[PDB]
Design a protein around this ligand. Structure first.
Ligand SMILES: [Zn+2]
Ligand SMILES: [Zn+2]
Lengths: 78, 185
Protein backbone atom coordinates (compact mmCIF):
# COMPACT_ATOMS: atom_id res chain seq x y z
CA UNK A 1 0.00 0.00 0.00
CA UNK A 2 0.87 3.76 -0.09
CA UNK A 3 0.69 4.99 3.53
CA UNK A 4 1.50 3.48 6.92
CA UNK A 5 -0.92 3.16 9.82
CA UNK A 6 -0.49 1.63 13.28
CA UNK A 7 -2.65 -0.95 15.02
CA UNK A 8 -2.17 -0.86 18.81
CA UNK A 9 -3.47 -3.85 20.84
CA UNK A 10 -4.51 -4.21 24.50
CA UNK A 11 -1.39 -6.33 25.08
CA UNK A 12 1.46 -3.87 24.51
CA UNK A 13 1.94 -4.76 20.85
CA UNK A 14 1.97 -2.32 17.93
CA UNK A 15 1.40 -3.60 14.41
CA UNK A 16 2.42 -1.48 11.44
CA UNK A 17 0.64 -1.76 8.11
CA UNK A 18 1.09 -0.29 4.65
CA UNK A 19 -2.37 0.48 3.22
CA UNK A 20 -4.42 2.51 0.73
CA UNK A 21 -7.09 5.04 1.75
CA UNK A 22 -9.38 2.92 -0.43
CA UNK A 23 -8.54 -0.26 1.47
CA UNK A 24 -11.62 -1.65 3.16
CA UNK A 25 -11.63 -2.36 6.92
CA UNK A 26 -11.98 -5.98 5.82
CA UNK A 27 -8.72 -5.55 3.86
CA UNK A 28 -6.97 -4.16 6.88
CA UNK A 29 -8.03 -7.23 8.90
CA UNK A 30 -6.70 -9.52 6.13
CA UNK A 31 -3.35 -7.74 6.41
CA UNK A 32 -3.45 -8.39 10.14
CA UNK A 33 -4.21 -12.10 9.63
CA UNK A 34 -1.23 -12.19 7.27
CA UNK A 35 1.10 -10.49 9.76
CA UNK A 36 -0.15 -11.83 13.11
CA UNK A 37 -2.16 -14.98 12.44
CA UNK A 38 -5.49 -13.62 13.71
CA UNK A 39 -8.65 -14.51 11.69
CA UNK A 40 -10.57 -11.43 10.51
CA UNK A 41 -13.86 -12.35 12.18
CA UNK A 42 -12.08 -12.41 15.55
CA UNK A 43 -10.89 -8.83 15.06
CA UNK A 44 -12.68 -5.60 15.91
CA UNK A 45 -10.97 -2.39 14.81
CA UNK A 46 -11.61 0.90 16.55
CA UNK A 47 -10.80 4.47 15.57
CA UNK A 48 -11.71 7.67 17.44
CA UNK A 49 -14.04 5.72 19.76
CA UNK A 50 -16.04 4.29 16.87
CA UNK A 51 -15.93 0.63 15.76
CA UNK A 52 -15.23 0.17 12.05
CA UNK A 53 -17.54 -1.75 9.72
CA UNK A 54 -16.13 -4.42 7.42
CA UNK A 55 -17.43 -2.88 4.17
CA UNK A 56 -16.31 0.72 4.66
CA UNK A 57 -12.85 2.12 3.82
CA UNK A 58 -10.14 3.99 5.69
CA UNK A 59 -11.08 7.14 3.73
CA UNK A 60 -14.74 6.80 4.85
CA UNK A 61 -13.42 7.20 8.43
CA UNK A 62 -10.81 9.88 7.58
CA UNK A 63 -7.85 7.62 8.46
CA UNK A 64 -4.62 9.19 7.22
CA UNK A 65 -0.86 8.59 7.29
CA UNK A 66 0.49 7.37 10.64
CA UNK A 67 -2.94 7.17 12.29
CA UNK A 68 -3.41 4.70 15.14
CA UNK A 69 -6.22 2.12 15.09
CA UNK A 70 -7.03 -0.06 18.07
CA UNK A 71 -7.53 -3.81 18.01
CA UNK A 72 -9.81 -5.61 20.45
CA UNK A 73 -10.42 -9.33 20.02
CA UNK A 74 -13.87 -10.85 20.14
CA UNK A 75 -14.57 -13.59 22.68
CA UNK A 76 -16.35 -16.78 21.56
CA UNK A 77 -16.79 -19.47 24.16
CA UNK A 78 -17.83 -23.07 23.90
CA UNK B 1 12.99 -18.50 42.20
CA UNK B 2 10.88 -20.44 39.71
CA UNK B 3 10.61 -20.22 35.93
CA UNK B 4 8.22 -21.90 33.49
CA UNK B 5 9.00 -22.61 29.81
CA UNK B 6 6.98 -23.38 26.71
CA UNK B 7 7.42 -26.66 24.85
CA UNK B 8 9.84 -24.84 22.57
CA UNK B 9 11.95 -23.39 25.36
CA UNK B 10 10.64 -19.83 25.51
CA UNK B 11 10.38 -18.47 29.06
CA UNK B 12 6.94 -17.41 30.31
CA UNK B 13 6.56 -14.42 32.57
CA UNK B 14 4.55 -15.07 35.71
CA UNK B 15 0.91 -14.09 36.03
CA UNK B 16 -0.40 -13.47 39.55
CA UNK B 17 -4.02 -14.52 39.81
CA UNK B 18 -6.12 -13.40 42.80
CA UNK B 19 -7.34 -16.53 44.64
CA UNK B 20 -10.70 -14.77 44.85
CA UNK B 21 -11.32 -14.44 41.14
CA UNK B 22 -12.67 -17.94 40.36
CA UNK B 23 -15.10 -17.81 43.29
CA UNK B 24 -16.30 -14.28 42.56
CA UNK B 25 -16.75 -15.04 38.86
CA UNK B 26 -19.05 -18.05 39.60
CA UNK B 27 -20.97 -15.78 42.02
CA UNK B 28 -21.34 -12.96 39.46
CA UNK B 29 -22.54 -15.22 36.67
CA UNK B 30 -24.65 -17.54 38.86
CA UNK B 31 -27.98 -16.23 37.43
CA UNK B 32 -26.81 -17.55 34.03
CA UNK B 33 -25.44 -20.86 35.36
CA UNK B 34 -28.83 -21.51 36.99
CA UNK B 35 -30.52 -20.80 33.64
CA UNK B 36 -28.17 -23.29 31.97
CA UNK B 37 -26.36 -20.35 30.23
CA UNK B 38 -22.54 -20.12 29.60
CA UNK B 39 -20.87 -16.83 30.62
CA UNK B 40 -17.50 -15.30 29.91
CA UNK B 41 -15.15 -12.62 31.17
CA UNK B 42 -11.78 -11.01 30.58
CA UNK B 43 -8.73 -11.19 32.85
CA UNK B 44 -7.15 -7.71 32.88
CA UNK B 45 -4.23 -6.22 34.72
CA UNK B 46 -0.74 -4.77 34.57
CA UNK B 47 2.89 -5.56 33.95
CA UNK B 48 5.15 -4.82 36.94
CA UNK B 49 8.89 -5.70 36.87
CA UNK B 50 8.64 -8.59 34.37
CA UNK B 51 5.51 -10.07 35.99
CA UNK B 52 1.78 -9.69 35.27
CA UNK B 53 -0.84 -9.00 37.92
CA UNK B 54 -4.47 -9.72 37.24
CA UNK B 55 -6.33 -6.85 38.94
CA UNK B 56 -9.70 -6.81 37.14
CA UNK B 57 -12.30 -9.34 36.12
CA UNK B 58 -14.40 -7.72 33.40
CA UNK B 59 -17.78 -9.11 32.38
CA UNK B 60 -18.34 -7.78 28.86
CA UNK B 61 -21.59 -7.30 26.96
CA UNK B 62 -22.38 -10.75 25.63
CA UNK B 63 -24.94 -13.22 24.26
CA UNK B 64 -25.16 -16.83 25.37
CA UNK B 65 -26.74 -20.23 24.96
CA UNK B 66 -26.35 -23.50 26.86
CA UNK B 67 -23.15 -24.39 25.01
CA UNK B 68 -21.83 -21.02 23.74
CA UNK B 69 -21.15 -17.42 24.74
CA UNK B 70 -19.78 -14.48 22.81
CA UNK B 71 -19.10 -10.76 23.15
CA UNK B 72 -21.29 -8.27 21.29
CA UNK B 73 -20.10 -4.70 21.96
CA UNK B 74 -16.31 -4.87 22.12
CA UNK B 75 -16.04 -1.07 21.78
CA UNK B 76 -17.20 -0.48 25.38
CA UNK B 77 -14.80 -3.22 26.51
CA UNK B 78 -12.07 -1.41 24.65
CA UNK B 79 -13.01 1.98 26.13
CA UNK B 80 -12.77 0.55 29.63
CA UNK B 81 -9.37 -1.16 29.20
CA UNK B 82 -7.79 1.76 27.33
CA UNK B 83 -9.10 4.42 29.72
CA UNK B 84 -7.63 2.45 32.65
CA UNK B 85 -4.52 1.10 30.92
CA UNK B 86 -5.44 -2.53 31.42
CA UNK B 87 -3.60 -5.30 29.61
CA UNK B 88 -5.62 -8.38 28.44
CA UNK B 89 -4.02 -11.40 30.16
CA UNK B 90 -6.61 -14.03 29.32
CA UNK B 91 -10.23 -14.98 29.71
CA UNK B 92 -12.62 -17.09 31.77
CA UNK B 93 -15.88 -18.89 31.06
CA UNK B 94 -18.29 -21.48 32.46
CA UNK B 95 -19.24 -24.98 31.33
CA UNK B 96 -22.62 -24.95 33.12
CA UNK B 97 -23.12 -28.69 32.54
CA UNK B 98 -20.05 -30.03 30.67
CA UNK B 99 -16.68 -31.38 31.79
CA UNK B 100 -13.57 -29.26 32.29
CA UNK B 101 -11.73 -29.13 28.96
CA UNK B 102 -11.09 -26.79 26.02
CA UNK B 103 -13.58 -27.18 23.18
CA UNK B 104 -12.81 -26.57 19.52
CA UNK B 105 -14.27 -23.05 19.81
CA UNK B 106 -12.21 -22.33 22.97
CA UNK B 107 -9.00 -23.33 21.18
CA UNK B 108 -9.58 -21.04 18.19
CA UNK B 109 -10.57 -18.17 20.49
CA UNK B 110 -7.58 -18.62 22.77
CA UNK B 111 -5.06 -19.02 19.95
CA UNK B 112 -5.57 -15.35 19.19
CA UNK B 113 -5.08 -14.20 22.80
CA UNK B 114 -1.89 -16.29 23.14
CA UNK B 115 -0.56 -14.88 19.85
CA UNK B 116 -1.02 -11.34 21.16
CA UNK B 117 0.45 -12.28 24.55
CA UNK B 118 2.53 -15.46 24.91
CA UNK B 119 1.50 -15.86 28.60
CA UNK B 120 -2.26 -15.54 27.98
CA UNK B 121 -4.39 -18.07 29.88
CA UNK B 122 -7.89 -19.52 29.53
CA UNK B 123 -9.69 -20.37 32.76
CA UNK B 124 -12.53 -22.94 32.44
CA UNK B 125 -15.10 -23.39 35.21
CA UNK B 126 -17.16 -26.63 35.33
CA UNK B 127 -19.34 -25.91 38.39
CA UNK B 128 -21.67 -28.93 37.96
CA UNK B 129 -18.55 -31.09 38.24
CA UNK B 130 -16.98 -28.83 40.89
CA UNK B 131 -13.81 -28.73 38.81
CA UNK B 132 -12.00 -25.93 37.05
CA UNK B 133 -8.92 -25.62 34.89
CA UNK B 134 -6.39 -23.14 33.61
CA UNK B 135 -5.20 -23.91 30.07
CA UNK B 136 -2.99 -22.71 27.21
CA UNK B 137 -2.00 -23.93 23.75
CA UNK B 138 1.26 -25.76 23.21
CA UNK B 139 3.89 -23.29 22.07
CA UNK B 140 4.77 -23.53 19.28
CA UNK B 141 3.08 -26.69 17.98
CA UNK B 142 -0.49 -26.02 19.17
CA UNK B 143 -0.45 -22.38 18.12
CA UNK B 144 0.77 -23.47 14.69
CA UNK B 145 -1.96 -26.15 14.41
CA UNK B 146 -4.82 -23.77 15.23
CA UNK B 147 -3.39 -20.85 13.19
CA UNK B 148 -3.19 -23.10 10.07
CA UNK B 149 -6.61 -24.69 10.74
CA UNK B 150 -9.44 -23.96 8.24
CA UNK B 151 -11.84 -26.75 9.14
CA UNK B 152 -15.55 -25.81 9.05
CA UNK B 153 -18.11 -26.46 11.74
CA UNK B 154 -18.28 -25.38 15.37
CA UNK B 155 -17.08 -28.61 17.01
CA UNK B 156 -14.46 -30.05 14.59
CA UNK B 157 -11.44 -32.02 15.97
CA UNK B 158 -7.71 -31.40 15.76
CA UNK B 159 -4.72 -33.57 14.97
CA UNK B 160 -2.40 -34.13 17.91
CA UNK B 161 -2.16 -32.65 21.39
CA UNK B 162 -3.02 -28.99 20.93
CA UNK B 163 -3.35 -27.58 24.48
CA UNK B 164 -2.29 -28.22 28.05
CA UNK B 165 -2.88 -27.11 31.67
CA UNK B 166 -0.66 -24.17 32.62
CA UNK B 167 2.37 -24.68 34.87
CA UNK B 168 1.69 -23.66 38.41
CA UNK B 169 3.17 -21.77 40.08
CA UNK B 170 5.80 -20.81 37.48
CA UNK B 171 3.51 -19.40 34.84
CA UNK B 172 0.36 -18.84 36.87
CA UNK B 173 0.50 -18.37 40.63
CA UNK B 174 -2.69 -17.98 42.69
CA UNK B 175 -2.16 -15.45 45.50
CA UNK B 176 -4.24 -13.49 48.05
CA UNK B 177 -4.52 -10.15 46.30
CA UNK B 178 -7.13 -7.47 45.69
CA UNK B 179 -9.61 -7.71 42.85
CA UNK B 180 -12.03 -5.39 41.06
CA UNK B 181 -15.01 -6.87 39.28
CA UNK B 182 -16.33 -4.74 36.43
CA UNK B 183 -19.72 -5.65 35.04
CA UNK B 184 -20.41 -3.96 31.69
CA UNK B 185 -23.70 -5.80 30.99
ZN1 LIG C 1 -15.46 -23.98 26.80
ZN1 LIG D 1 -9.80 -25.77 14.10
Amino acid sequence: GSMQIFVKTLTGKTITLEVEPSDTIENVKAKIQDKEGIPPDQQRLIFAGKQLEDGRTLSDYNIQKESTLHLVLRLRGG
Amino acid sequence: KIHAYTEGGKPLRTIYLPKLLKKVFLDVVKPNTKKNLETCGILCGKLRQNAFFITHLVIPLQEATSDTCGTTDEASLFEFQDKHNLLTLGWIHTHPTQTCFMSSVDLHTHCSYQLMLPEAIAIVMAPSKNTSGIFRLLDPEGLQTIVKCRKPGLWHPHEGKVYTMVAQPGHVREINSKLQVVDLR
